Homo-oligomer: A and B are copies of this chain.
Amino acid sequence: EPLLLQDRDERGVVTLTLNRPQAFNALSEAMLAALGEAFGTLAEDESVRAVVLAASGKAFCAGHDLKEMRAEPSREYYEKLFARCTDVMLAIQRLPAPVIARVHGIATAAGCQLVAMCDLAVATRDARFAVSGINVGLFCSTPGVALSRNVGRKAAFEMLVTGEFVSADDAKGLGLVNRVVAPKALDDEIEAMVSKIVAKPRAAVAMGKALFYRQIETDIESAYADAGTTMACNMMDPSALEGVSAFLEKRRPEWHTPQ
Contact = CB atoms under 8 A, between A and B. Distances in A.
Interface stretch (A17-25, A53-61, A145-153, A181-189): A145-153
Interface string A214-248: 01110111011101111111111101111111111
Nearest to A203: B137
A175 B161 contact: no
Interface in A178-218: 178, 193, 196-197, 200-201, 203-205, 207-209, 211-213, 215-217
B205 A161 contact: yes
A103 interface: no
A79 B149 contact: no
A227 B144 contact: yes
Given A145-B215, A244-B70, A208 B160 contact: yes
- How many identical subunits does the complex contain? 3
Contact of A134 (B157, B200, B233): B200
24 contacts: A79-B228, A83-B228, A93-B220, A120-B154, A121-B154, A134-B204, A134-B205, A137-B200, A137-B241, A139-B207, A139-B208, A139-B231, A141-B208, A141-B212, A141-B228, A141-B230, A141-B231, A145-B223, A148-B215, A149-B153, A150-B154, A151-B152, A160-B212, A161-B197
Among all A-B residue pairs, the 10 with the closest Cβ atoms: A137-B243, A139-B208, A78-B232, A152-B175, A82-B228, A136-B243, A141-B227, A137-B240, A141-B231, A137-B239
